[PDB]
């Protein structure tokens, strides 16, 4: 069975985001035109949410619960994948298409929307492992 499919959680393993967690958005299994190695687009968390506790006020909880997302094309050798999953496939059209990432303005817009939806899923309380940072 293949375990590198969109929606699975993956820890980036090497380079300026090693140790960050992420979710595979779409997989370029059969290489590409200019990347003959196998690779796959991934969206992760550059800045994890800080711990939320009951003691702090609502403004500080909102302060502490925000995320910073990053889009990266990663070689499979550079990602060490995991069983866990993120059920948000609603970025399929958002960050999909081999066009939504070529340009900077487009990329940053995609990251803003991905921030909004990953913050919503962090609010939901599910997928706590995806938002607790790998403590290495």
């Amino acid at each position: 069975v293949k375990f590198l499919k969109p929606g699975k959680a993956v820890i980036l393993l090497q380079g300026r985001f090693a140790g960050r967690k992420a979710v595979i958005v779409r997989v370029f299994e059969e290489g590409t035109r200019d990347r003959p190695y196998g690779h796959c687009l991934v969206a992760g968390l550059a800045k994890y949410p800080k711990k939320v506790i009951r003691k702090d006020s609502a403004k500080k909880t909102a302060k502490k619960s925000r995320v910073k997302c990053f889009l990266k094309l990663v070689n499979f050798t550079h990602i060490m994948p995991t069983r866990y999953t993120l059920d948000v496939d609603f970025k399929d059209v958002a960050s999909g298409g081999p066009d939504a990432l070529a340009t900077r303005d487009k990329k940053v817009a995609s990251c803003k929307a991905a921030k909004a939806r990953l913050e919503e899923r962090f609010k939901t309380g599910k997928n706590r492992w995806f938002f607790t940072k790998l403590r290495f």
Binding site: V1, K2, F3, L4, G38, F76, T77, M80, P81, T82, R83
Partner: protein, 98 residues
């Protein structure tokens, strides 16, 4: 039956498709193209446990060889050190038949 696995693997070497080495056994796992993994006993514990992890994810069987990495190379009838193995096509043999 260490000799009974050694002889079967010797036959897989002549008949079936097989792949040696960590960096390519991993590629077989990500392609899911492999069907069985053989691991030398002294494969470095980090490497061994991560291959075990990918095997668990890929629902693929892992067998732990009874010798060492030099012994696995000799069993595969290769002149070098081998600590990882993947059986792509079992061929005319009985390894998966366990």
């Amino acid at each position: 039956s260490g000799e009974n696995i050694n002889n079967k693997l010797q036959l897989v070497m002549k008949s079936g498709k097989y792949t040696l080495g960590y960096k390519t056994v991993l590629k077989t796992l990500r392609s899911s193209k492999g069907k069985l993994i053989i691991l030398a006993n002294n494969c470095p514990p980090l490497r061994k446990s991560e291959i075990e992890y990918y095997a668990m994810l890929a629902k693929i069987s892992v067998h732990h060889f009874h010798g060492n990495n030099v012994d696995l190379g000799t069993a595969c009838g290769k002149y070098y050190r081998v600590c990882c193995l993947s059986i792509l096509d079992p061929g005319d043999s009985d390894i998966i038949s366990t």
